[PDB]
């Protein structure tokens, strides 16, 4: 509750505020001359493990990791279970770097035990495009908790950032840390009704039966915008016009090229479902939703939470209430449990009338080295897996 590793970084103190003006790094005018040519040292018997995550051994020991000893939430209910599919689409995005999929091995045994990656992004914050290192999926086993080894993973992929003249990342935690650019409570559409409420993610309202609780929560019969489709390869250009136009209104944002937009929403079956409403080589609408199902944990009726995530949705013929409608919609076509989204973008104006419950916390989205006033959430325009 101190801080004591994190204020030595250049981040925010907890209870710094910026004037509205200023947009820079803490520390500038950095040189990958002066960056630490080797790995820090580790106690002895254990050795850092740059990933092949390509590799199926290499992959699998990351997907171990994360399955029994990632993200957890505040009640110990669930544990995110990212699939070894997903993994791969997260960390291949385009132009990424091997070495910034490092591990940490415990050498008696040879198994991961420790975890962190990065991949490279234009992010334009407050109108200024920098690239920066997206960092993501930092674990350590449970066995090793509260030794120390998370400031040394965060402090070794640094360094590796470091090394290719990046000076910037952009993260997003669940928990409190200095200090976040801003902070995002979740909502949830329910879908699948009965099974929410019995493992303890949906409360039942007291004046509602569980069988009128089901009635009540059903999704819209039909599309409201009735072209949907899975989004083609064709379509990449199209969607980067669209996508790219939206997301410039926005204080912060991804900078997407063309070979990113591939990588990100050409849809792959229980990972990444992209839909368009196509009109002569125009993406008039979209609806972008990514899997990520949720161990549940100590239940046996059930095996996983299986919940869909909103990623990017833009409409022009519709009203963004009919867009999303459409996606829980598609989210229920799909079957899956629950459509969960942030107050981000344009989302928190349609929450209230398409039946979204509040979550129990919020995603926090943070900078690191970089100065500039926070800002609500409706001016954010990333979602970061
Ligand atoms: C230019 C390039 C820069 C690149 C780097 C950019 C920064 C990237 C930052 C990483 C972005 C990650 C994005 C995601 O992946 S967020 C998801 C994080 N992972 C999990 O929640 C999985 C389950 N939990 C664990 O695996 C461990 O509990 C973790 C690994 C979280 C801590 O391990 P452990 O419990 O064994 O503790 P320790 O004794 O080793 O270390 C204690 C220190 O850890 C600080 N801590 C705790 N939780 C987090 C957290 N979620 N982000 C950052 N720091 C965190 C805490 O303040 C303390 O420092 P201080 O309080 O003394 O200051
Ligand atoms: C159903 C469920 N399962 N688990 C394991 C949880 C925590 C939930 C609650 C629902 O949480 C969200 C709902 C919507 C968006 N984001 C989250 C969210 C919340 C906390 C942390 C994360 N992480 C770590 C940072 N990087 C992204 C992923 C994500
Ligand atoms: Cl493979
Ligand atoms: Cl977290
Ligand atoms: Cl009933
Ligand atoms: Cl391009």
């Not at 008696?108 to 420790?114: P, Q, R, T, V």
């Not at 209230?352 to 979550?359: A, I, N, Q, R």
Request: charged share 25%; hydrophobic share 40%.
């Amino acid at each position: 509750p101190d801080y004591k590793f994190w204020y030595t970084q250049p981040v925010p103190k907890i209870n710094d505020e910026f004037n509205e003006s200023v947009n820079e790094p803490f520390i500038s005018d950095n040189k990958v001359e002066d960056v630490r040519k080797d790995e820090y040292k580790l106690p002895p018997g254990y050795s850092w493990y740059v990933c092949d995550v390509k590799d199926e051994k290499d992959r699998s020991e990351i997907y171990t990791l994360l399955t029994d000893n990632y993200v957890e939430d505040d009640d110990n209910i669930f544990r995110f279970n990212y699939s070894a599919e997903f993994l791969l689409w997260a960390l291949t995005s385009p132009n990424y770097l091997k070495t910034w999929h490092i591990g940490v091995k415990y050498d008696a045994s040879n198994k991961l035990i420790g975890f962190i990656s990065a991949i490279p992004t234009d992010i334009c914050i407050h109108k200024r495009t920098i690239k920066m290192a997206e960092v993501n999926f930092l674990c350590v086993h449970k066995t090793l908790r509260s030794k120390r080894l998370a400031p040394v993973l965060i402090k070794e992929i640094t360094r590796r950032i470091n090394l290719e003249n990046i000076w910037q990342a952009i993260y997003t935690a669940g928990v409190y840390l200095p200090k976040p650019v801003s902070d995002a409570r979740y909502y949830h559409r329910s879908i699948n009704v009965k099974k929410l409420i019995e493992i303890g993610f949906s409360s039942l309202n007291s004046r509602l039966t569980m069988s009128r609780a089901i009635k009540l929560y059903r999704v819209e019969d039909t599309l409201n915008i009735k072209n949907m489709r899975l989004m083609k390869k064709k379509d990449v250009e199209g969607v980067h016009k669209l996508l790219g136009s939206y997301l410039e209104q926005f204080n912060l944002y991804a900078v997407f090229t063309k070979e990113e937009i591939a990588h990100w929403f050409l849809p792959i079956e229980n990972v990444i479902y992209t839909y368009v409403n196509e009109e002569n080589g125009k993406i008039k609408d979209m609806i972008s939703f990514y899997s990520l199902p949720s161990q549940i944990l100590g239940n046996d009726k059930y095996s996983t939470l299986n919940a869909a995530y909103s990623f990017y949705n833009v409409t022009t013929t519709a009203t963004f209430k009919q867009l999303m409608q459409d996606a829980i919609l598609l989210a229920k076509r799909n079957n899956f449990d629950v459509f969960n989204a942030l107050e981000v973008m344009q989302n928190k104006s349609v929450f209230e009338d398409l039946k979204f419950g509040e979550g129990d916390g919020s995603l926090k989205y943070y900078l690191y080295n970089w100065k500039c006033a926070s800002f609500a959430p409706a001016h954010v325009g990333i979602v970061l897996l």
